[PDB]
Amino acid sequence: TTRPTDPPVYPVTVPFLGHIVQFGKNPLEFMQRCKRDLKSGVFTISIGGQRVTIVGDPHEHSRFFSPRNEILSPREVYTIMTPVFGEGVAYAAPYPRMREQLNFLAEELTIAKFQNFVPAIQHEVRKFMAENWKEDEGVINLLEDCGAMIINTACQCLFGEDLRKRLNARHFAQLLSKMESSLIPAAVFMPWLLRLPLPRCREARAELQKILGEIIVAREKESDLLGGLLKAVYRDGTRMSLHEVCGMIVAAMFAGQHTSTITTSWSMLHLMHPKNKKWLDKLHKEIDEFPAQLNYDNVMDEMPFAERCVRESIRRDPPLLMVMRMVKAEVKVGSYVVPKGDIIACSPLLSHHDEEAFPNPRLWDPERDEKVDGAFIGFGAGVHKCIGQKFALLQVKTILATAFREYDFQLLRDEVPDPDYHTMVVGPTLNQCLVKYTRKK
Ligand code: HEM
Ligand SMILES: OC(Cn1cncn1)(Cn1cncn1)c1ccc(F)cc1F
């Protein structure tokens, strides 16, 4: 079964690997085991004879990230999420409707769009803090409260008043919530591997669609994200259907909700920890210079340290652990060739723990730089680099800047939380994010 060019191979049984996943075993240790015993950063896990090739050598990142869809294809490997977004909507939109739709989305999230996003995000953060952090001091779940701030501020930024009246952020976040109710690794991993349907979350879509479809008529009967998606064309002259606009609105809120929530929480948890006083003080040296009301230029271009804070949070504990493609034509990676039919993967989690690229990788050090160019991949790279990355950072950084200007925070355990590997998109353990707020003097 070997070819003169293939990477080293580690056989596993499906049960044995199934067991590792179901039981939420640290996936970093398993991949680091493999990287060492096979003495290669590029290596294959043969599951049921089912080849998964990992680009775990940060010097080889571009070999994963740069090829076109026709060579390394995202479609086949994410097709299981189709019920999430709908049948002809993203990874399920046939060629070339997938790239066309992602690009429409991308175009709704450029820096020309962000106009008054910042004041809008500050007002929502301050409404929240005013409604929820009312006392001189009080106890909260930081993970839960960041997620609220993330949905509220996202919807305020992206949605018009008709939308926010019919579908409030609370509602939105429930509907989103009961979808990744069926995207746990323990349940998805095996049908993802076999090529089996997603094992409830199509009921939540049909609720949204009906709701949006009403909103959508109300408007055509009578410049936000919805309105921009509604104006989108396509190469062939036709526009997106209701079903496609709903699906891309979902893909959007879905993509950014859990990832940004988690990044904000890790950032705040590191910063508040007594051993990171130096950084919190550094953070203040930067943000104490600014007025009550921030602008785009303030947050995007005059907070380099806040940004390092966010970036290193995603570096140490990236929320998307692993990014995949189907190899459609064999591809050169390092001194190996990765054959047609392989699943090829590149893992932020694995590369962000490479000792050369990120020495002492468990130390959250905001002043760190990658020691191998392009080793950091928390938002991916190349053809499929994240296109909400700028909105994400504008959002998280404004929240950090707004929350730390008014409050101090005590973490109510001794150590920063354990990541919890039981969810698809990975964050700190919920019960471990209990925190005391203290209103500034
Ligand atoms: C902190 C927040 C975020 C993180 C950490 C993050 C992380 C990532 C990563 C690792 C990828 C690589 C995908 C791959 O190679 O398969 C990606 C892509 C992508 N992201 Fe994000 N992302 C974030 C926020 C968002 C937001 C807010 C949106 C939309 C509103 C978004 C939309 C997308 C899309 C459409 C792609 C891939 C497009 C394609 O397949 O060509 N992301 N993101
Ligand atoms: O890349 C994802 C899909 N994915 C990969 N593993 C689990 N889900 C996630 N993502 C990207 N940025 C933030 N989250 C994505 C790609 C496109 C999309 F529309 C949604 C979506 F979640």
Residue numbers in the entry: 26 to 224, 228 to 250, 259 to 477
Task: Provide the authors' own sentences about this structure as they appear in the paper.
Both T. cruzi and Leishmania parasites have an essential requirement for ergosterol, and are thus vulnerable to inhibitors of sterol 14α-demethylase (CYP51), which catalyzes the conversion of lanosterol to ergosterol. Here we report the crystal structures for the CYP51 target in T. cruzi (CYP51Tc) (resolutions 2.35 Å and 2.27 Å) and that of the closely related CYP51 ortholog from Trypanosoma brucei (CYP51Tb) (resolutions 2.7 Å and 2.6 Å), each bound to an anti-fungal triazole drug, either fluconazole or posaconazole. Nevertheless, CYP51Tc and CYP51Tb do share 83% sequence identity, a fact which has been crucial for successfully determining their crystal structures and makes it possible to extrapolate structural features learned from one enzyme toward the other.
Although largely a backbone trace at 3.2 Å resolution, this structure served as a search model for molecular replacement in determining the CYP51Tc–fluconazole structure at 2.35 Å, which was used as a search model against the 2.27 Å CYP51Tc–fluconazole data to reveal an alternative conformation of fluconazole bound in the active site. The two CYP51Tc–fluconazole structures reported here superimpose with r.m.s.d of 0.68 Å, revealing some conformational differences in the F-helix and the BC-loop, which may account for the distinct fluconazole binding modes and result in re-packing of protein molecules in the crystal lattice. As expected, fluconazole is bound in the active site by coordination to the heme iron via the aromatic nitrogen atom of a triazole ring and by multiple van der Waals and aromatic stacking interactions. The 2,4-difluorophenyl moiety is enclosed in the pocket formed by the heme macrocycle, the aromatic side chains of Y103, F110, Y116 (BC-loop) and F290 (I-helix), and aliphatic side chains M106, A287 and A291. Although fluconazole occupies the same pocket in both CYP51Tc structures, it adopts two conformations that differ by the 180° flipping of the 2,4-difluorophenyl moiety. A 2.6 Å H-bonding contact between the 2-fluoro substituent and the hydroxyl group of Y103 may help to stabilize orientation 2, which appears to be less sterically favorable than orientation. In orientation 1, the H-bond between the 2-fluoro substituent and Y103 is broken due to the 3.5 Å reorientation of Y103 toward M360 resulting in the 2.7 Å H-bond to its amide nitrogen and in the flipping of the 2,4-difluorophenyl ring into a sterically more favorable orientation with the fluorinated edge facing away from the heme macrocycle. Perhaps both ring conformations co-exist in the CYP51Tc-fluconazole complex, possibly correlated with the conformation of the BC-loop which affects H-bonding pattern of Y103.
